[PDB]
From Swiss-Prot:
PETase retains the ancestral alpha/beta-hydrolase fold but exhibits a more open active-site cleft than homologous cutinases. It is found in: Secreted. Poly(ethylene terephthalate) binds at residues 60, 134, 158. Belongs to the AB hydrolase superfamily. Pathway: Xenobiotic degradation. Has potential for application in environmental remediation and biological recycling of PET and PEF waste products. Optimum pH is 9 for PET film hydrolysis. Optimum pH is 9 for PET (commercial drinking bottle) hydrolysis. Optimum pH is 6.5-8.0 for BHET hydrolysis. Optimum pH is 8.0 for the hydrolysis of pNP-esters. The enzyme is active at pH 6-10, has an optimal pH range of 7-9 and it is rapidly inactivated below pH 7.0 or above pH 9.0. Induction: Highly up-regulated during growth on PET film. This is Poly(ethylene terephthalate) hydrolase. It is an enzyme of class 3 (hydrolase).
Length: 263
């Protein structure tokens, strides 16, 4: 019958490109981070049902600031989002993946903690992973190791290996055309091309530096639309979002677009 995971009003381009989704968002600092450095949890106060959870990790040297904009953007569409600082700013992808999963674990913990703002707000069976650069590579490692994850949407990813052929999780890769740190041709695009078993998408931002999908980027309408659409489609099984998730967007800002096995 009806999709039990559908939340919020029917989407439009305008509603997805807006700064804010339909739900009101609040946030808190994690009191006692369990297996990672620090965290902020963003959550909808008025979603109308339990929602999935997404953990987001920065890149090398970076902190929550780099990725913070996703917290309100996703949460306002009906997700609990945790942004983390790693135990060390110099942690590598494998460690970042462990920490990202520890953050998802702690969101599950807090969903069961009566004092927490997110008590009973999370569907702990529906989780997703995002992150920047090494944190993007960490997201792909998370997905490879935990195939029950429902979606992955890393940005400007890097890992020491580009072979993510084992990933069966729906994966959207944001890439940055002019990336000097993790060049698209040797990092993001090979990673994309390695994935053969999944729904997948590649979206490269014209003229973008390595930080082109970070807080303060000038393409929040497009990037935020795609990130929310992908997560809605795959974490919520919400086919209202199938066209937004799968389409080549009509944007001046897109300089490479690829997708496979999308529905």
């Amino acid at each position: 019958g009806a999709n039990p995971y559908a939340r919020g009003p029917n989407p439009t381009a305008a509603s997805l490109e807006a700064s804010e989704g339909p739900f009101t968002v609040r946030s808190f600092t994690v009191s006692r981070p369990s297996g990672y450095g620090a965290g902020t949890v963003y959550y909808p106060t008025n979603a109308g049902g339990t929602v999935g959870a997404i953990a987001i990790v920065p890149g090398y040297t970076a902190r929550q600031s780099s990725i913070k904009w996703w917290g309100p953007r996703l949460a306002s569409h009906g997700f609990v989002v945790i942004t983390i600082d790693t135990n060390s700013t110099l942690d590598q992808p494998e460690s970042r993946s462990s920490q990202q999963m520890a953050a998802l674990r702690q969101v599950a913990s807090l969903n069961g903690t009566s004092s927490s703002p997110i008590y009973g707000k999370v569907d702990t069976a529906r989780m997703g992973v995002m992150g920047w650069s090494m944190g993007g590579g960490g997201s792909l490692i998370s997905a490879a190791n935990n195939p029950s994850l429902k979606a992955a949407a890393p940005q400007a990813p890097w890992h020491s290996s580009t072979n993510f052929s084992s990933v069966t999780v729906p994966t959207l890769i944001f890439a940055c055309e002019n990336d000097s740190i993790a060049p698209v041709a040797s990092s993001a695009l090979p990673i994309y091309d390695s994935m053969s078993q999944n729904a997948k998408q590649f979206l490269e931002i014209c003229g973008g530096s390595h930080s082109c999908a970070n807080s303060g980027n000038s393409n929040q309408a497009l990037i935020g639309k795609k990130g929310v659409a992908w997560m809605k489609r795959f974490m919520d099984n919400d086919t209202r979002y199938s066209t937004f998730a799968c389409e080549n967007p009509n944007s001046t800002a897109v300089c490479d677009f690829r997708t496979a096995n999308c529905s």
